[PDB]
Symmetry: D2
Subunit: 116 residues, 4 copies
């Protein structure tokens, strides 16, 4: 899969399971078009968001619903979400792994970008 989102809970040192992830793609008129969405699995990984055909060049935004995640665990987090906005596939198709490492008042988002 060309786009994978991984979410870790840095409080529990665990995959962040059942985290909603929405992917949007910036349309020609600069709106965010819904591109794909999903939930992280039991491994904190979200696979199959898209395909190599569908995942064309563009600016993509990945909004990870970190607030609902923290809230379901009784935590009032700082952020509404963890975002990742990036140009994808500018110099040809890549595999993107987006790793979000979550704490209630901090997150980090990293891209592991590999050439398939």
């Amino acid at each position: 899969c060309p786009l994978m989102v991984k979410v870790l809970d840095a409080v529990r040192g665990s995959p962040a399971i059942n985290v909603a992830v929405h992917v949007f793609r910036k349309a020609a008129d600069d709106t965010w078009e819904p591109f794909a969405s999903g939930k992280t699995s039991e491994s904190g990984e979200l696979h199959g968001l898209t395909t190599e055909e569908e995942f064309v060049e563009g600016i993509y935004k990945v909004e990870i619903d970190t607030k609902s995640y923290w809230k379901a665990l009784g935590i009032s987090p700082f952020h509404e979400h963890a975002e990742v906005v990036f140009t994808a596939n500018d110099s040809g198709p890549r595999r993107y792994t987006i790793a979000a490492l979550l704490s209630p008042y901090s997150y980090s988002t990293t891209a592991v970008v590999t050439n398939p």
Copy 2:
């Protein structure tokens, strides 16, 4: 100073200077209304973005133009920007420091909320 944005360069171990930061308040129609912006100073800090009177509860987005910063340094960045979206809670009093640690393919943002 109820809101202060601090930006660090994890590649050079330095303040990320001259980083454009835009703050938006979520408007009733779910759109982002420009609220404040600035450039990080020589200390990587952006003060005076807002005032206590202006900084009411609401959802705020802090957009840090991390891409232009990395471009200015000649390093290919992953992200278009860093985008900190949060609810100002105002169960107070509260100062917000938003620290963004910046690497070309990674960033962290942390809120240090005090007082």
Copy 3:
């Protein structure tokens, strides 16, 4: 494997390949006994450091040679290494994934700890 070390290069958005990783275990006399070592693979992952039999309770230190890594890429990094010191298996055997996210002047080390 009960202990896995993953290393990512946050500058290149890539696995940090061929990174030396040394694992020590705190002996009875508070010295660090060499426990295991290895290199991260092409995926930035180091598997097979140890086994469930060998990986008994203890305090373990994982020293990731981040300096040699950065130096081989022409970068003078801040840290000599990325360390992780933790008590392992205190309430029974666990799987530990240690993820180190590396920048020349910053690193983050996260543990994904799962119950096998």
Copy 4:
């Protein structure tokens, strides 16, 4: 103040206050010689660890007792401590800020090296 340690709590979004920090200098026999220590203040910062005269080039270890901090808060931590090991380079002048962002199962440490 050539060396300043700052510790943040990523769980509470606060300075990590009263965090024990030990600084060691690597001795010629490859062992760690205690050099300086302190507790983070109410601002999560530990100043006055050393002086310019004392802080010569060398390999330093900053041990942040993250475990006791998490215990004091009732949260099971992963790490025994956070351990920042680095060469003071002294191609100068140089101030070192070591920021440690602290989560129970994760920490980041960043050096902001200025001047």
